């Protein structure tokens, strides 16, 4: 119900750093109420690499309670930051406008040492 618009066409969602996730949803052929997530992510966070160009995203979405999980590998023709982020969370449709609330993990290397850093991103729709 509350995701009727979300599931039609592409939409742009902007987080606190100004980065933009563009999502498209396609129904799963076998998983009830589930969708494949496609689209692109543009990182606009100052003080990072891989800024200002689209990176494909992919994941999965559950319509029954509007939960999502999606990932980006930070490699494209413009810039390679040799790392990957996974976001998992939920669309909160309870307020005056929708907010996508996520926790993320960033896997990366610092020298020869692997690391996984956690954080949180909240996105609001740009319409």
């Amino acid at each position: 119900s509350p995701d009727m618009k979300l599931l039609a066409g592409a939409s742009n969602w902007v987080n606190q750093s100004g980065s933009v996730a563009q999502f498209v949803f396609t129904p799963s052929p076998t998983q009830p109420q589930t969708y494949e997530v496609s689209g692109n992510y543009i990182n606009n966070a100052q003080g990072t690499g891989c800024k200002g160009t689209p990176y494909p995203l992919s994941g999965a979405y559950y319509s029954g309670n509007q939960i999502i999980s999606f990932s980006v590998v930070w490699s494209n023709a413009s810039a390679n930051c040799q790392s990957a982020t996974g976001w998992t969370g939920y669309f909160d449709f309870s307020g005056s406008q929708a907010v996508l609330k996520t926790d993320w993990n960033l896997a990366f290397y610092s020298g020869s040492t692997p690391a996984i850093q956690q954080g949180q991103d909240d996105f609001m729709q740009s319409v």
Binding site: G49, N80, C81, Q82, S83, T85
Partner: peptide, 11 residues
Amino acid sequence: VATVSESLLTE
């Protein structure tokens, strides 16, 4: 000719 950074957080 992609620009390479050590990680997303280290330009």
